[PDB]
C-alpha cells in the first residue's frame, strides 16, 4: 500500500545512447495510498 518514487537528474554530453557510468538514485517520496496498479501511461506536451 506504499507507492515509492525514486529520482535522479544528470546532465549528459553524449548524444543518444545511455552513458557508461554508475550513479545511485536517492529516494524522492513515499505515498501511503492503496491501489492495485497493473498498467500505466505517459504524458506528452504537444504544440497545438
Amino acid at each position: 500500500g506504499y507507492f515509492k518514487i525514486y529520482s535522479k537528474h544528470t546532465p549528459i554530453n553524449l548524444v543518444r545512447d545511455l552513458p557508461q557510468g554508475f550513479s545511485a538514485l536517492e529516494p524522492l517520496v513515499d505515498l501511503p495510498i492503496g491501489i492495485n496498479i497493473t498498467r500505466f501511461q505517459t504524458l506528452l506536451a504537444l504544440h497545438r
Binding site: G1, Y2, P32, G34
Partner: protein, 49 residues
C-alpha cells in the same frame, strides 16, 4: 421547527456532531500528538528516538 427562546428543555435547538473513525484498513494519517520530553547528554539513560 418552532424554536423559540421561550421554549423549555426538549425544544431548544441543539448542535450535534458525530465523529467516526476507521479500523485497520489503510495507513494512518490523523492521530493524537505524541508527547515529547527534552534531551539529556553524557548520562547512561534509555531512549526512544
Amino acid at each position: 421547527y418552532g424554536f423559540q427562546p421561550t421554549n423549555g428543555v426538549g425544544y431548544q435547538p441543539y448542535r450535534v456532531v458525530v465523529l467516526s473513525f476507521e479500523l485497520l484498513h489503510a495507513p494512518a494519517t490523523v492521530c493524537g500528538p505524541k508527547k515529547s520530553t527534552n534531551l539529556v547528554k553524557n548520562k547512561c539513560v534509555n531512549f526512544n528516538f
